[PDB]
Amino acid sequence: ALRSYTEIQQLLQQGKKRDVKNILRENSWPINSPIRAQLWPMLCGQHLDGFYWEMVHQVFGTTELSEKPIMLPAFVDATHCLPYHLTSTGRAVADRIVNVLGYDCPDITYSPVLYPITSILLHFMSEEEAYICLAGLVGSKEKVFINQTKLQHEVTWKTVMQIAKKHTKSATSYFQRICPGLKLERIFMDWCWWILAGLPFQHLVRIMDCYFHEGIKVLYRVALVILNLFHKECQSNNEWSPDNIKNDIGNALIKFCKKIPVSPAKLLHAAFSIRGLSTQYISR
Ligand SMILES: O=P(O)(O)O[C@@H]1[C@H](O)[C@H](O)[C@@H](OP(=O)(O)O)[C@H](OP(=O)(O)O)[C@H]1O
Numbered sequence: 454a455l456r457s458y459t460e461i462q463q464l465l466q467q468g469k470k471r472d473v474k475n476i477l478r479e480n481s482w483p484i485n486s487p488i489r490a491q492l493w494p495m496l497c498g499q500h501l502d503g504f505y506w507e508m509v510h511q512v513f514g515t516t517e518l519s520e521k522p523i524m525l526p527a528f529v530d531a532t533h534c535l536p537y538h539l540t541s542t543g544r545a546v547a548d549r550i551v552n553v554l555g556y557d558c559p560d561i562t563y564s565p566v567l568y569p570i571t572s573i574l575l576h577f578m579s580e581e582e583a584y585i586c587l588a589g590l591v592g593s594k595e596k597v598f599i600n601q602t603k604l605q606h607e608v609t610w611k612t613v614m615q616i617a618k619k620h621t622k623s624a625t626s627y628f629q630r631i632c633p634g635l636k637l638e639r640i641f642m643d644w645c646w647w648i649l650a651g652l653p654f655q656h657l658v659r660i661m662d663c664y665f666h667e668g669i670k671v672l673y674r675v676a677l678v679i680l681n682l683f684h685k686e687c688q689s690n691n692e693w694s695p696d697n698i699k700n701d702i703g704n705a706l707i708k709f710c711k712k713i714p715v716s717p718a719k720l721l722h723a724a725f726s727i728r729g730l731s732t733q734y735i736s737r
Pocket residue numbers: 667670727728729730731732733
């Protein structure tokens with residue numbers, strides 16, 4: 454039997470965050486489960502009743518959703534406004550949310566992650582609830598969820614690079630070998646896109662479950678796992694032989710993720726097996 458929303462909400466009010474953290478890690482609620490409509494707005498909230506629509510009005514002058522394609526704020530990665538399974542109306546709603554966010558949060562200058570997440574939220578809750586999740590995450594003062602400046606963006610992928618150099622040293626050494634002269638920076642600049650634009654939606658959802666509770670470290674972990682799985686795969690295999698991937702390891706990783714050979718649960722099992730990732734270690 455799987456855990457339920459009200460169970461977790463109780464534990465949360467009591468303050469058993471490790472218990473909640475572990476439930477989220479091990480409970481693989483199906484893709485259709487109604488729990489996320491309730492589970493996710495709470496998780497995001499843990500870190501104004503009609504405030505959203507006020508913002509909506511001030512920007513667009515109306516509550517009514519446009520059919521005209523909406524112009525996105527410059528902080529979005531135009532190449533990565535990943536819609537996933539959102540309908541045409543779903544995308545238009547996403548466009549409205551990020552416009553509102555850009556309007557109310559002027560310090561967000563570069564956040565290629567913000568739109569893909571907005572789309573994910575919209576798969577399980579309403580437009581206003583998605584917003585309130587996002588504003589919670591972005592405004593988090595302790596935990597980090599969504600990078601908002603280009604400086605933060607680059608410190609982050611450099612951090613991930615540093616972590617990968619030790620925890621998946623074989624994979625990175627393997628990259629340098631098959632591709633001499635290659636600077637690993639070019640590869641890790643796109644680390645989040647392995648997850649957000651590679652892994653199947655099914656895998657993303659389970660990842661979001663833990664991510665909305667723990668933060669960006671969950672994403673760090675999954676990045677390591679993908680790198681290990683990709684190196685293992687490269688050792689004996691169809692298309693991921695050195696000759697086909699040396700040309701572009703970058704999208705070789707993306708292609709590999711789209712056809713990732715492990716279940717969401719087996720993927721998540723590896724990530725949390727990884728030890729030593731102290732929060733102030735990654736600050737060093
Ligand atoms: O014991 P290990 O093997 O070193 O593993 C980590 C360690 O226990 C830290 O206390 C903790 O980091 P922080 O509490 O400082 O974030 C992290 O929690 P986590 O699994 O929730 O990330 C653990 O994974």
